[PDB]
Design a protein around this ligand. Structure first.
Ligand SMILES: Cc1cc(C)nc(SCC(=O)Nc2cccc(COc3ccccc3)c2)n1
Ligand SMILES: [Zn+2]
Length: 296
C-alpha cells in the first residue's frame, strides 16, 4: 500500500534503509543509475551545461550529431567527437563497486543504467545483471540488416583513434556503436526486463540521475506501492512537476522515499558503513583501482 498502510521502512533515512536492507524483507534490489555515478571517474555528464556539447563539425544544426539518420549518411563528425570524448582511463567509482558488492552479497536483481561508458562491466557487473537502457560502447554492429557483424570495443577504439571511419570487414557498411542515437528505439531488453523485474523488487536504489530523460525516468513509477526508494544524488529529483505520481520525500504523506543529497561515492560509502561493508568496499576498490592503474 501507500501512506495508508504499514510501511516497510522504520524511518525515512539512510539508517532506516540500511536496517531494511539487512532485514528478511529486503532480498532484491534494483539500481537505477545515470551520469552522476561516473563524473567522479572523470567522465563528464554530456547533458550537464558545465560540460556541454564547442562543435564546429560544420553540422547543418547541433542535434544532427545525435541523430541516427544524419549519422548514417555523415558519420565522420560523430567519430571525431567520439575521439575527443574518449576517456583517458576507465576506473569505476566507489558507487560502481558498491553495486558489485550488492551482487556479491546476493542482493542485486538488476542495474538499469543510462550510461554508455562500460564502467558497470569493468566494475564486475555481468551482462545478465545489466540493462543498458541507452545502449553502450562495449559492442558495435555493422548497420546492414543482412550482415550485422558484431565488433568489440577494442576494434572500435583503434578505428576511433586512428581516425578511420569504421567499416565492416565482411560488407564494408558502416559500423555503429551499440549506443541509442536519437531516432532509435531503446533496446528491447529494456522493456522485457522492466516487465519482469519490477514484479520482484524490494528496494529501488536511484543514484546519480535527475530522472529527466524518458522513458528511463518512468521506471520509478513501475515499483510496487510499498517498495522503498532511496535517491543518492546531488539534487532532489523525481518529484512530480507541479505544473505538469513521483517521489514524495518531505510531505506528511511521505512513507517510503528517502533522499540522501551529495556525491554518489559519499552516499554509497555512508550506506556501506552502516551496513558493516566499509572495509569490504575499501578493499575491493583499492584492489581493482590498483589493477587498473597497473595495466601494462
Ligand atoms: C567506451 C567509451 C567510448 C567513448 C567514445 N566514450 C565513452 S563515455 C564518454 C562519452 O560521453 N562519449 C561520447 C562519444 C560520442 C558521443 C557522445 C554523446 O553523443 C551521442 C551521440 C549519439 C548517441 C549517444 C550520444 C558521447 N566510453
Ligand atoms: Zn557488415
Amino acid at each position: 500500500g501507500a501512506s495508508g498502510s504499514e510501511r516497510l521502512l522504520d524511518e525515512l533515512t539512510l539508517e532506516g534503509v540500511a536496517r531494511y536492507m539487512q532485514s528478511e524483507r529486503c532480498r532484491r534490489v534494483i539500481c537505477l543509475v545515470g551520469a552522476g555515478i561516473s563524473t567522479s571517474a572523470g567522465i563528464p555528464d554530456f547533458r550537464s551545461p558545465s560540460t556541454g556539447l564547442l562543435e564546429k563539425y560544420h553540422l547543418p544544426y547541433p542535434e544532427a550529431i545525435f541523430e541516427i539518420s544524419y549519422f548514417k549518411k555523415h558519420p565522420e563528425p560523430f567519430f571525431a567527437l567520439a575521439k575527443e570524448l574518449y576517456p583517458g582511463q576507465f576506473k569505476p567509482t566507489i558507487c560502481h563497486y558498491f553495486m558489485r558488492l550488492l551482487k556479491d552479497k546476493g542482493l542485486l536483481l538488476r542495474c538499469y543504467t543510462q550510461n554508455i561508458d562500460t564502467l558497470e562491466r569493468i566494475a564486475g557487473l555481468e551482462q545478465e545483471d545489466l540493462v543498458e537502457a541507452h545502449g553502450t560502447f562495449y559492442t558495435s554492429h555493422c548497420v546492414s540488416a543482412s550482415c550485422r557483424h558484431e565488433y568489440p570495443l577494442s576494434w572500435m577504439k583503434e578505428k576511433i583513434f586512428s581516425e578511420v571511419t569504421p567499416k565492416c570487414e565482411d560488407c564494408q557498411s558502416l559500423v555503429k556503436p551499440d549506443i541509442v542515437f536519437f531516432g532509435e528505439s531503446l533496446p528491447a531488453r529494456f522493456f522485457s526486463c522492466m516487465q519482469s523485474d519490477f514484479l520482484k523488487v524490494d528496494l529501488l536504489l536511484v543514484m546519480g540521475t535527475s530522472l529527466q530523460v524518458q522513458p528511463f525516468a518512468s521506471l520509478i513509477s513501475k515499483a510496487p506501492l510499498s517498495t522503498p526508494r532511496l535517491l543518492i544524488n546531488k539534487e532532489k529529483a523525481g518529484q512530480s512537476d507541479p505544473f505538469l505520481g513521483g517521489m514524495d520525500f518531505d510531505s506528511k504523506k511521505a512513507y517510503r522515499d528517502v533522499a540522501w543529497l551529495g556525491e554518489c561515492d559519499q552516499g554509497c560509502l555512508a550506506l556501506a558503513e552502516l551496513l558493516g561493508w566499509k572495509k569490504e568496499l575499501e578493499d575491493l576498490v583499492r584492489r581493482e583501482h590498483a589493477s587498473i592503474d597497473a595495466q601494462s
